[PDB]
Amino acid sequence: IRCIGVSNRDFVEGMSGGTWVDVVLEHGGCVTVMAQDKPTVDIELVTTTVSNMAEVRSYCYEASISDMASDSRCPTQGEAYLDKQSDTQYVCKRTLVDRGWGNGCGLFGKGSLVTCAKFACSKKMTGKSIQPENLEYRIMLSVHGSQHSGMIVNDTGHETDENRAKVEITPNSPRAEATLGGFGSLGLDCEPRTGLDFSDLYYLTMNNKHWLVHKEWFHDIPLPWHAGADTGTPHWNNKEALVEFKDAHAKRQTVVVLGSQEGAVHTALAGALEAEMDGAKGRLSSGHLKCRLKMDKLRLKGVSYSLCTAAFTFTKIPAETLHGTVTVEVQYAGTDGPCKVPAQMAVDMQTLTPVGRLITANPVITESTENSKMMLELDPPFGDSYIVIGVGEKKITHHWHRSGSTIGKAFEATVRGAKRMAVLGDTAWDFGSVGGALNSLGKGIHQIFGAAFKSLFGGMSWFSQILIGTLLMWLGLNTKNGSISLMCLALGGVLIFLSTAVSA
Amino acid sequence: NMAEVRSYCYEASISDMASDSRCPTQGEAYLDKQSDTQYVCKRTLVDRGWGNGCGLFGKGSLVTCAKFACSKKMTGKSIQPENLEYRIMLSVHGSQHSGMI
Amino acid sequence: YLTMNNKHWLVHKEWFHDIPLPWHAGADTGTPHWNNKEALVEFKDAHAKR
Amino acid sequence: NMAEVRSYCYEASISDMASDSRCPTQGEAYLDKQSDTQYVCKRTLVDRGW
Amino acid sequence: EVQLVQSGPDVEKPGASVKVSCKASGYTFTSNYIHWVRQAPGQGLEWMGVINPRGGSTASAQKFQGRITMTRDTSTSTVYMELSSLRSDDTAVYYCARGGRALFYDSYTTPRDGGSWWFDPWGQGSLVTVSS
Amino acid sequence: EVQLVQSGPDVEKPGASVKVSCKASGYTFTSNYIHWVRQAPGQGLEWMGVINPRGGSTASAQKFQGRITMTRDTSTSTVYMELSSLRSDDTAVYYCARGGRALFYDSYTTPRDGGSWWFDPWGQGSLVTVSS
Amino acid sequence: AVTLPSHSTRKLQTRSQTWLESREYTKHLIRVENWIFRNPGFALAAAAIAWLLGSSTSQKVIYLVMILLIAPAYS
Amino acid sequence: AVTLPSHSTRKLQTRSQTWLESREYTKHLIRVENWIFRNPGFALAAAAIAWLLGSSTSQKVIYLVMILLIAPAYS
Amino acid sequence: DIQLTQSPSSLSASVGDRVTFTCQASQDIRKYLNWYQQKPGKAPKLLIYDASNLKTGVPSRFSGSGSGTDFTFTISSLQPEDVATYYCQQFDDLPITFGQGTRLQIK
Amino acid sequence: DIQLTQSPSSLSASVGDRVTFTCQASQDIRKYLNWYQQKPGKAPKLLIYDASNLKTGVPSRFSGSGSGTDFTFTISSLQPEDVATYYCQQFDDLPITFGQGTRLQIK
Ligand SMILES: *[C@@H]1O[C@H](CO)[C@@H](O)[C@H](O)[C@H]1NC(C)=O
C-alpha cells in the first residue's frame, strides 16, 4: 500500500530484539519496514513546510529611469555638482568629458560633468530567510493488510481510519507515536535539523515563484539591495550595475536601464529547488531526514483470526515492481467476519512448500460483505512461481516467475545503496539501522572524510568534477609508489561516480 | 538598406500545458497537442505504478508540453558592403574664426 | 545589424549565427514558427512523475 | 486483447506543392504552408541569379 | 451535488464547426473522464469519444477522426467539444458524462468501472441541428 | 484577354471565415503576383497582402496577421483568400490584382515594377458584409 | 551586468533533479564545439602552440586541451 | 536558454568604443577571483595536480594556470 | 468488432408483467456490460452496471444477468414509469457501441 | 510605416480646366509611386505607373511627375468622364498604403 509503483522505494528489516529501525526518511520515495511480528509498515514523506520566514534583503531587476541630468562644468572650475545627486533616489556617476572652444568655458580641455537620473524600479525579489526552527515536516504512513486500493485519493478519512496515519514533526516536538487503534503505536523520533542543512538557505520569491537558495549565492548577487529594508521609499543599494552610463566619443553622456533581468536570474538560478504554496505557509518538495523508528507496541490484530474457507479470485493480473515484488488484489465473497486469509507461494503443490518473501503479513478481511478486494503483495524467488491464495482445493493459484536472479538482486541492491551513498552522503549510513560497531564506524569515517570532501572540493560542478575525475585517473596511472597514486585513483573514481548522479 | 535575416526571441510565455500519460506498455504518449508546432513538447519516461491506473506497471511514458508564445523579438538584420554610405566633412584653415562644427 | 529593444549594434555574423535562442530563422509575416524552441523553456518532472 | 501501439504508413500521396523562393539575402524562406504539420517541408539553399 | 450541464441547443451550417460546453458540479473536476456520446433523433446511442478534464487527454472513434476536438478548461471546470466539417448526420443530441477512476489521463478500462460508470451526470442533452 | 474575376458578394457571421475566389484569364497564371487590397465603403484602399500563384508563397500586413490565409489553385488558375475571425471592420470590398515580374515566389519589389504594376485585372470587387 | 555565478559551481548533490541539468550537462560541450566550428584555424594554432610545450608526446595533447579549453569561454 | 555567444569572441577592432568593454576587460578576472574565493582548497588541489605534470618546474605553473582556468567558467 | 445485437426490437405488455431483454455481442465482454432506459427528451434511467449489479436508488423491480457473451435484463413487474427505450452497451476495447433499442408500451 | 498625404481632400472644377494633385510621403519613394482614379462601383481607371509614365490606352489628358518625396498628377483638360476619386500609392518597403483620396465634381 501507498508505496507500490513509487520506485526508489526500499525494504528494511530489523534483527529482532530491540526495535532500532532508524530509517532515512525520504521526501522522494517510500520505505517499507518488515518484521516477523509487528505488521509490515510503510512510510512516505508527503510534504515539507516552513511556517515563519524573515524578510532579509530584497532585489530589484526591473528598473526605470527618468528626469536625467548632466551638469556640465568647465575644464577648470572644480568638477560638477548637480544638486540632483544630493538625493539617493537618483543614481549618479561622475565623468570627465571633453570641453572645447565654442562650448562656453573660456578655457578648454578635459572638463567634467555628472550624468544621472532617477532610479525607479519594479518587480522586487523577496529573498526571505528561514531557520531550522518553526519549519515543519509532514508525513503519512500506512500498514498493509486491509484497505483495498489504499491509494492516497481519499486520504482524508484514512488518517481517521486504521490503515493510514498522518504525522506532523517539529524541531520542538520530534517524537510522535503513530497510533493505530488495533495495530500499534509506531514510535518515531527524528532529527528535524540535519535534513537540508538549513540556516544557509533562503526562500526566494520573485514573480510569485518560490524556491530555496544557498544563502551564500543569494548574498553574492550584484543587483540593487532593499538590503534589509521595510516600508519607506526603498533606498536601493549599489544602484550601479543595473543602469549603464554612456557618453559620446567625448561628450553628451546619457543612461540606459538594461530593462528587466527576470529570465537572467532564472538562468543564473541553475541549482535552486522550486517551492510552492507560500502564504504564511511555505511548502517545498523533497528533503530527507533521519528517523529513529521503534516497534515498541504493534499488535497484529487477528493472529487468532480463522482462515475462512471461501474461494478467492484474483482481479488484476498481479504485475510486479522494479523491486521484484508483486502485488495482487484478490476479491472474494462467500464467507464473513474479520477473516485471516492464507497467502503463500511454491514451485510445486501437493506440497504448497511455503517459500519466498511474504511482505503483507497477516492479511485481514473486515466484513461479511461481498467480494472484498483484499489488496496485498508478495515477492517470489528468482525462478518460476506458483502464488497460492485461497486455502486448499477451492483455492486460486497463478504462475509468476519473477525472472530476477539472486546475483541480480545484489546488483540492484548495491547500485541502489551506492546512489544512496552518493546523494545522502553520511546519512546513507544507519539506513539499515542497527547500532552495530561498524555502523557507527562507517558513519564516522564518512563524517570526517566527506566533510573534508566538501570543504576541499567545495560544490564541484558537473563539468568541473568530470574533468577533475578524468585527470585524477590519468595521474593514477602515471605516478610511482601506488600508495598515493592509488589515492588519486580513489578520489578520481569518487568524482566520476558523483558524476553518475541522478542526473542520468 | 538592411535585409531581415533570422530574428530571435528571448522573452517567451507558456500556457495551456499538457502531459498525456501512458501506461508502461501501450506504446508511448501521443498528445494530439504535440501535432502543432506553436506548442513545444518533449517526451519523457515517467514512473507508473499500481493505484495509478495501468493494470501493469513500471516505467511508463508521457509527453509534457505547452504553447510557446513569445515577445521582444531580436531583429538581427543584415547589411552588405554596398548601399552603405560614408559621410565626412573637411575644412581648410585660414579664415572662419571659430570654425567649430 | 542587431536591433533588440530599439537598441542597435553591429555583430560579427558568426556570433549571430551561433546564438541558441528560438529562430524566426528567416521569416516574414505569419505566425512565427520558432526554431529549436527548447533551450528557452525548461521541462521538469517530480522525482518520478508529474 | 491487443493494444494499438504506433501504426505505420507506407503508401503516401502528395499534392498542392510549394516552394517559396527568397533572395540571397533577406533571411530565408518562410512559406506559411510550412506552418501546418499535415504538410511535410524541407528547406534548401538554391541558386538565385540576375 | 454531482451534476453536469450542457449549453443550449444550436443550429449550424453544413461544413461549419459547433462547440458545445459541459460544466460540472459537485465533484473535483479532475477526477472523472468526460465521455461524449451522440444520439440521432430516431437512432440509438453511439459513443463519440472521451477526454480527461486533467491534462486535456483525448480519444474518439473513427466515425469522427479529423473532425472532433475536445478540450479542457480547468478554471470553470468545463469541457468543450468541437465538431468540424458538419454533415447532415450531425443533427442529433450529444451527451457529456463523468466517468470512473480518472486517475491520470486516459480511458483506462482494463481496470474497474461502474458505480455510475458514466451515468451520474448525464446532464440535459445538447440538441444540434445542421442546415441552412 | 488579361482579366481577373472575383466571386459574388457574401455575408458572414462575426468570427467566421470568408473565402473569396479570384480567377484569371488571358495570361499564364504563374506569371503575376496576386495582390489583395481592402476598401471599407467610406475608407480608402489599404493593401491586404500578396500571394504568388506559383508555389503558393504568401505575405501580408500586421493588420491581418493570424486571420488571413491565401492559397493557390494551379488547375483552374485561381487564388483563394480566407479571412478568419471576422470583425465589424471586415465589411468592405476586397480586390485581387495581377502584378509585375512574378519570377519565382515573392513580392520582389527592389527590382522593377509598373506596366500595370498591379492594375490591369482589378476585376469587379468582392463586397463582403459581416453581421447577423 | 555579467550574471557571473553559474550556480552549477555550487551544485546540490541531492536526490531530486536540479534546476536545468537537462541542457546543462551538454551546454559546455556545445559551447566549445560551436566556438571551434566558428574559429577553425585556431585548431592548428593550438596545435603549434602545444607541440612546443611539454615535449613529451603525452603532455602535448594536455596543452592542446589547455588551449582549446581556455579559448571558448573566457573569450 | 544558454545565451551562449559572448560576442567579445567576435570583437570589432574599430575606433569607436564597443558595447560594454568598461566592465568586460575586468569581468573574467572578477569571475576567476570570485570562484576561487568561494572554492579555496581547490588551490592546493590544482597544485598537487600540476606539480605531477610537466615535470619542469616551469610547465608546472603552466598546468596550474590550466586547472585554475578550467575550473571557473566551464563549471 | 463490437457488434452487439439487442433483442427484441420492441415489446408491449400489461402492468405487473415480467419482461426480459437479451443482448449478445460477437465478442467476449466478460462483465463490462451496462443497461439504461431513456424516455424521449430524458436523461436515461439508472438500471444496471456490470450487467449484474443494481445501483443505489434503483428499484429492485429490475435485474440483470449473463456471463459470457449474451446477457438478460428483466423487469419483475411492469409499471407506468417503465415506458422508455432500453439500451444495453459494452465497455471494453473502446469502440464503445450501444444497442439500437428495446421499446416499451403499456396496454 | 509609409505615411503618405494626398492633397487636397476634394476639388470641383469646370470642363476644360487643368487640375493638379499632390502627394508627399514621409519616406523616400524614389520612383515607386502610382496613380489611379476610381468611380463608386468601378474598377479604377488607368492613370499612372512609376509616377511619370503613361500607360497604353490612357489619354494624354493625364500626366504625372515628381522625384524625391512629393509628386504631382495633372489633368490637362477636364472632361465629364473625369469624375472619380483619385488615388496615389507607393510600392516600396511593403506596408503598401494608398491615399485617402482626391474627389472631383463637374460644375
Ligand atoms: C475512498 O474513500 C472511502 C471512504 O469514503 C474509502 O473507504 C476508500 O478506501 C477510498 N478509496 C481510495 C482509493 O482512496
PDB file of N, CA and C in Angstrom, chain G residues 15-63:
ATOM      1  N   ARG G  15      19.042  14.164  -4.122  1.00  0.00           N
ATOM      2  CA  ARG G  15      18.332  13.186  -4.937  1.00  0.00           C
ATOM      3  C   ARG G  15      17.360  13.795  -5.936  1.00  0.00           C
ATOM      4  N   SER G  16      16.674  14.879  -5.604  1.00  0.00           N
ATOM      5  CA  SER G  16      15.730  15.407  -6.572  1.00  0.00           C
ATOM      6  C   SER G  16      16.481  16.127  -7.679  1.00  0.00           C
ATOM      7  N   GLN G  17      15.895  16.105  -8.865  1.00  0.00           N
ATOM      8  CA  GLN G  17      16.565  16.663 -10.024  1.00  0.00           C
ATOM      9  C   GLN G  17      16.686  18.180  -9.906  1.00  0.00           C
ATOM     10  N   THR G  18      17.875  18.689 -10.240  1.00  0.00           N
ATOM     11  CA  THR G  18      18.235  20.086 -10.017  1.00  0.00           C
ATOM     12  C   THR G  18      17.577  20.977 -11.059  1.00  0.00           C
ATOM     13  N   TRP G  19      17.996  22.237 -11.187  1.00  0.00           N
ATOM     14  CA  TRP G  19      17.167  23.185 -11.927  1.00  0.00           C
ATOM     15  C   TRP G  19      17.117  22.859 -13.416  1.00  0.00           C
ATOM     16  N   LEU G  20      18.249  22.942 -14.118  1.00  0.00           N
ATOM     17  CA  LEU G  20      18.217  22.811 -15.572  1.00  0.00           C
ATOM     18  C   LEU G  20      19.258  21.831 -16.092  1.00  0.00           C
ATOM     19  N   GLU G  21      19.561  20.787 -15.321  1.00  0.00           N
ATOM     20  CA  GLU G  21      20.634  19.865 -15.683  1.00  0.00           C
ATOM     21  C   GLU G  21      20.469  19.332 -17.098  1.00  0.00           C
ATOM     22  N   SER G  22      19.216  19.188 -17.546  1.00  0.00           N
ATOM     23  CA  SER G  22      18.923  18.539 -18.820  1.00  0.00           C
ATOM     24  C   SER G  22      19.783  19.102 -19.936  1.00  0.00           C
ATOM     25  N   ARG G  23      19.783  20.416 -20.095  1.00  0.00           N
ATOM     26  CA  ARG G  23      20.665  21.048 -21.060  1.00  0.00           C
ATOM     27  C   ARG G  23      22.034  21.362 -20.481  1.00  0.00           C
ATOM     28  N   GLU G  24      22.174  21.391 -19.158  1.00  0.00           N
ATOM     29  CA  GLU G  24      23.448  21.790 -18.586  1.00  0.00           C
ATOM     30  C   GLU G  24      24.537  20.770 -18.849  1.00  0.00           C
ATOM     31  N   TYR G  25      24.263  19.483 -18.670  1.00  0.00           N
ATOM     32  CA  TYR G  25      25.354  18.533 -18.853  1.00  0.00           C
ATOM     33  C   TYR G  25      25.643  18.264 -20.323  1.00  0.00           C
ATOM     34  N   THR G  26      25.266  19.208 -21.188  1.00  0.00           N
ATOM     35  CA  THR G  26      25.723  19.280 -22.566  1.00  0.00           C
ATOM     36  C   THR G  26      26.100  20.691 -22.997  1.00  0.00           C
ATOM     37  N   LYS G  27      25.798  21.711 -22.191  1.00  0.00           N
ATOM     38  CA  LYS G  27      25.906  23.087 -22.664  1.00  0.00           C
ATOM     39  C   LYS G  27      27.353  23.494 -22.886  1.00  0.00           C
ATOM     40  N   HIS G  28      28.264  23.065 -22.021  1.00  0.00           N
ATOM     41  CA  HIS G  28      29.658  23.440 -22.214  1.00  0.00           C
ATOM     42  C   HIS G  28      30.253  22.740 -23.429  1.00  0.00           C
ATOM     43  N   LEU G  29      29.846  21.496 -23.677  1.00  0.00           N
ATOM     44  CA  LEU G  29      30.286  20.825 -24.893  1.00  0.00           C
ATOM     45  C   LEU G  29      29.789  21.556 -26.127  1.00  0.00           C
ATOM     46  N   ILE G  30      28.505  21.916 -26.151  1.00  0.00           N
ATOM     47  CA  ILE G  30      28.032  22.661 -27.311  1.00  0.00           C
ATOM     48  C   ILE G  30      28.714  24.018 -27.392  1.00  0.00           C
ATOM     49  N   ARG G  31      29.070  24.605 -26.249  1.00  0.00           N
ATOM     50  CA  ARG G  31      29.867  25.824 -26.212  1.00  0.00           C
ATOM     51  C   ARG G  31      31.161  25.671 -26.986  1.00  0.00           C
ATOM     52  N   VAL G  32      32.007  24.752 -26.536  1.00  0.00           N
ATOM     53  CA  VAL G  32      33.323  24.608 -27.134  1.00  0.00           C
ATOM     54  C   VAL G  32      33.200  24.203 -28.592  1.00  0.00           C
ATOM     55  N   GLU G  33      32.239  23.333 -28.913  1.00  0.00           N
ATOM     56  CA  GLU G  33      32.132  22.849 -30.285  1.00  0.00           C
ATOM     57  C   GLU G  33      31.642  23.945 -31.221  1.00  0.00           C
ATOM     58  N   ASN G  34      30.663  24.727 -30.782  1.00  0.00           N
ATOM     59  CA  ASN G  34      30.241  25.889 -31.542  1.00  0.00           C
ATOM     60  C   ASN G  34      31.388  26.863 -31.743  1.00  0.00           C
ATOM     61  N   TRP G  35      32.109  27.181 -30.669  1.00  0.00           N
ATOM     62  CA  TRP G  35      33.186  28.158 -30.774  1.00  0.00           C
ATOM     63  C   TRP G  35      34.255  27.702 -31.756  1.00  0.00           C
ATOM     64  N   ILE G  36      34.638  26.428 -31.700  1.00  0.00           N
ATOM     65  CA  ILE G  36      35.671  25.962 -32.615  1.00  0.00           C
ATOM     66  C   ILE G  36      35.147  25.821 -34.035  1.00  0.00           C
ATOM     67  N   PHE G  37      33.874  25.459 -34.203  1.00  0.00           N
ATOM     68  CA  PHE G  37      33.275  25.434 -35.529  1.00  0.00           C
ATOM     69  C   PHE G  37      33.256  26.824 -36.141  1.00  0.00           C
ATOM     70  N   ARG G  38      33.235  27.856 -35.302  1.00  0.00           N
ATOM     71  CA  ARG G  38      33.289  29.217 -35.819  1.00  0.00           C
ATOM     72  C   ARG G  38      34.710  29.716 -36.026  1.00  0.00           C
ATOM     73  N   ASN G  39      35.669  29.232 -35.247  1.00  0.00           N
ATOM     74  CA  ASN G  39      37.060  29.679 -35.349  1.00  0.00           C
ATOM     75  C   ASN G  39      37.954  28.479 -35.612  1.00  0.00           C
ATOM     76  N   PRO G  40      37.873  27.894 -36.808  1.00  0.00           N
ATOM     77  CA  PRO G  40      38.580  26.632 -37.057  1.00  0.00           C
ATOM     78  C   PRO G  40      40.092  26.723 -36.967  1.00  0.00           C
ATOM     79  N   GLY G  41      40.738  27.586 -37.758  1.00  0.00           N
ATOM     80  CA  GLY G  41      42.192  27.632 -37.803  1.00  0.00           C
ATOM     81  C   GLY G  41      42.848  27.734 -36.443  1.00  0.00           C
ATOM     82  N   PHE G  42      42.102  28.203 -35.446  1.00  0.00           N
ATOM     83  CA  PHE G  42      42.603  28.141 -34.089  1.00  0.00           C
ATOM     84  C   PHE G  42      42.974  26.725 -33.687  1.00  0.00           C
ATOM     85  N   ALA G  43      42.431  25.718 -34.372  1.00  0.00           N
ATOM     86  CA  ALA G  43      42.856  24.345 -34.126  1.00  0.00           C
ATOM     87  C   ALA G  43      44.359  24.206 -34.306  1.00  0.00           C
ATOM     88  N   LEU G  44      44.846  24.424 -35.527  1.00  0.00           N
ATOM     89  CA  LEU G  44      46.276  24.286 -35.770  1.00  0.00           C
ATOM     90  C   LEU G  44      47.072  25.355 -35.039  1.00  0.00           C
ATOM     91  N   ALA G  45      46.444  26.485 -34.716  1.00  0.00           N
ATOM     92  CA  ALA G  45      47.102  27.416 -33.805  1.00  0.00           C
ATOM     93  C   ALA G  45      47.461  26.732 -32.492  1.00  0.00           C
ATOM     94  N   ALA G  46      46.447  26.240 -31.783  1.00  0.00           N
ATOM     95  CA  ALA G  46      46.670  25.486 -30.559  1.00  0.00           C
ATOM     96  C   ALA G  46      47.639  24.338 -30.776  1.00  0.00           C
ATOM     97  N   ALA G  47      47.587  23.706 -31.945  1.00  0.00           N
ATOM     98  CA  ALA G  47      48.481  22.588 -32.216  1.00  0.00           C
ATOM     99  C   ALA G  47      49.934  23.033 -32.187  1.00  0.00           C
ATOM    100  N   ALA G  48      50.276  24.039 -32.988  1.00  0.00           N
ATOM    101  CA  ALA G  48      51.642  24.545 -32.990  1.00  0.00           C
ATOM    102  C   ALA G  48      52.045  25.053 -31.616  1.00  0.00           C
ATOM    103  N   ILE G  49      51.098  25.590 -30.849  1.00  0.00           N
ATOM    104  CA  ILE G  49      51.434  26.046 -29.506  1.00  0.00           C
ATOM    105  C   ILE G  49      51.822  24.864 -28.630  1.00  0.00           C
ATOM    106  N   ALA G  50      50.899  23.921 -28.452  1.00  0.00           N
ATOM    107  CA  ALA G  50      51.112  22.792 -27.558  1.00  0.00           C
ATOM    108  C   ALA G  50      52.296  21.932 -27.971  1.00  0.00           C
ATOM    109  N   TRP G  51      52.432  21.631 -29.263  1.00  0.00           N
ATOM    110  CA  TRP G  51      53.558  20.837 -29.737  1.00  0.00           C
ATOM    111  C   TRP G  51      54.894  21.465 -29.364  1.00  0.00           C
ATOM    112  N   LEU G  52      54.887  22.715 -28.916  1.00  0.00           N
ATOM    113  CA  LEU G  52      56.094  23.382 -28.461  1.00  0.00           C
ATOM    114  C   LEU G  52      56.219  23.426 -26.944  1.00  0.00           C
ATOM    115  N   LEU G  53      55.278  22.844 -26.210  1.00  0.00           N
ATOM    116  CA  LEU G  53      55.349  22.780 -24.757  1.00  0.00           C
ATOM    117  C   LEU G  53      55.241  21.338 -24.292  1.00  0.00           C
ATOM    118  N   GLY G  54      55.790  21.062 -23.116  1.00  0.00           N
ATOM    119  CA  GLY G  54      55.701  19.731 -22.553  1.00  0.00           C
ATOM    120  C   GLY G  54      56.783  18.818 -23.083  1.00  0.00           C
ATOM    121  N   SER G  55      56.915  18.757 -24.409  1.00  0.00           N
ATOM    122  CA  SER G  55      57.961  17.961 -25.046  1.00  0.00           C
ATOM    123  C   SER G  55      57.913  16.514 -24.571  1.00  0.00           C
ATOM    124  N   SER G  56      56.709  15.948 -24.552  1.00  0.00           N
ATOM    125  CA  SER G  56      56.510  14.600 -24.052  1.00  0.00           C
ATOM    126  C   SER G  56      55.796  13.673 -25.022  1.00  0.00           C
ATOM    127  N   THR G  57      55.126  14.201 -26.047  1.00  0.00           N
ATOM    128  CA  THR G  57      54.189  13.481 -26.906  1.00  0.00           C
ATOM    129  C   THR G  57      53.022  12.935 -26.105  1.00  0.00           C
ATOM    130  N   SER G  58      52.963  13.220 -24.809  1.00  0.00           N
ATOM    131  CA  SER G  58      51.832  12.887 -23.969  1.00  0.00           C
ATOM    132  C   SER G  58      51.266  14.100 -23.251  1.00  0.00           C
ATOM    133  N   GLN G  59      52.114  15.012 -22.785  1.00  0.00           N
ATOM    134  CA  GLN G  59      51.644  16.300 -22.305  1.00  0.00           C
ATOM    135  C   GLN G  59      51.257  17.224 -23.443  1.00  0.00           C
ATOM    136  N   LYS G  60      51.660  16.891 -24.669  1.00  0.00           N
ATOM    137  CA  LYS G  60      51.304  17.715 -25.815  1.00  0.00           C
ATOM    138  C   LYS G  60      49.794  17.816 -25.965  1.00  0.00           C
ATOM    139  N   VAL G  61      49.108  16.676 -25.965  1.00  0.00           N
ATOM    140  CA  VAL G  61      47.655  16.717 -26.038  1.00  0.00           C
ATOM    141  C   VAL G  61      47.083  17.418 -24.816  1.00  0.00           C
ATOM    142  N   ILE G  62      47.786  17.366 -23.686  1.00  0.00           N
ATOM    143  CA  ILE G  62      47.300  18.045 -22.494  1.00  0.00           C
ATOM    144  C   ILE G  62      47.306  19.551 -22.700  1.00  0.00           C
ATOM    145  N   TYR G  63      48.360  20.077 -23.319  1.00  0.00           N
ATOM    146  CA  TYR G  63      48.365  21.504 -23.609  1.00  0.00           C
ATOM    147  C   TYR G  63      47.417  21.840 -24.752  1.00  0.00           C
TER     148      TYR G  63
END
